[model samples]
Target: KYYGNGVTCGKHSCSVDWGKATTCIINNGALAWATGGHQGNHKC
Candidate 1:
């Protein structure tokens, strides 16, 4: 996965730096995101 600061963490789980973002890659397409909480200003 690629973070906002141009850092590449090619794995399922990772830790991005401050102000950076997070993402992941799923093999079988069993993906998910924040759905029922304080999303604030984010979408998927």
Candidate 2:
């Protein structure tokens, strides 16, 4: 379900400058609809 957020950067929801927050979702460690480094709904 919700595995929480990944590595984040300064003063923001997360940073994609160095590397986007690894906003991911895995069905028990496989692969779901992971937002891996995309400038999507989350903060950039």
Candidate 3:
């Protein structure tokens, strides 16, 4: 999940700011990236 601007993985789903860079950990504990897929009201 996302801690403000930092991204970390966990067992639960992700919940981040609607206008911030977002990332998450898969159910398989895989590392996820935003790359250029992230979109929000705030610039990343």
Candidate 4:
């Protein structure tokens, strides 16, 4: 999901079967930061 210009946040958890999951934060349509999580959860 994309937050756009809102100051909102979200989190997601990856299942063991899903392996690694990645996410990122964007600002003005550009990537601000990114990270990967494995069988765990992360906040964005």
Candidate 5:
């Protein structure tokens, strides 16, 4: 489910019974640093 500040979980939980699942985390503030960082998703 969607967490606070654009964060989310369970997007790639082991409970998924479909295509490849992934764990995603979005850090808007880090993306603002422009250190090649961005707010988006990922696979865990």
Candidate 6:
């Protein structure tokens, strides 16, 4: 997970048998401006 300029992003790796997931959020100060959809990868 990482936070920068009020924006937050995260990455999660599943089990070796599964895959990986990623997410992100864009925020301006108090309220969130936008949010990214979850992404999955098959490079387990």
Q: Give a tens-digit lDDT track for model 5, residues 1-44.
A: 43333443342222222342333333333433455543433222
lDDT of 3 at 20: 51
For residues 1-44, what per-residue lDDT tens digits would candidate 2 score against the true structure? Answer: 12223433333233332343344311211221353433223331
> In candidate 6, which residue pairs clash?
none
RMSD of every prediction: 10.2, 9.3, 10.5, 10.5, 9.4, 12.0
Off by over 4 Å in 5: 1-26, 35-44
For TM-score, the strongest prediction is 3
Instruction: Tell me the deviation in Å of residue 22 in model 2.
Output: 4.6
Q: For residues 12-35, write the lDDT of model 1, one tens digit per residue.
A: 333446655444222111232434
TM-score of each: 0.25, 0.16, 0.27, 0.18, 0.19, 0.18
User: What is the per-residue lDDT of model 4 for residues 1-44, given as tens digits with 9 covering 90 to 100?
Assistant: 42232323334322221232233332311322244432123323
Please give the range of 10 consecutive residues that has the lowest summed lDDT in model 6: 25-34
Off by over 4 Å in 2: 1-7, 17-44
Instruction: Give each model's whole-structure lDDT.
Output: 0.34, 0.30, 0.36, 0.30, 0.35, 0.25
Clashes of each: 0, 0, 0, 0, 0, 0
Find the candidate with the highest lDDT and give its number.
3
TM-score computed on alpha carbons, candidate 6: 0.18
lDDT of 1 at 22: 46
Instruction: Please give the lDDT score for candidate 1.
Output: 0.34
Question: Residue 40 error for model 3, in Å?
Answer: 22
**After best superposition, candidate 1 residue 7: deviation in angstroms?**
3.9
Between candidates 3 and 5, which one is better according to TM-score? 3
lDDT of 5 at 42: 28
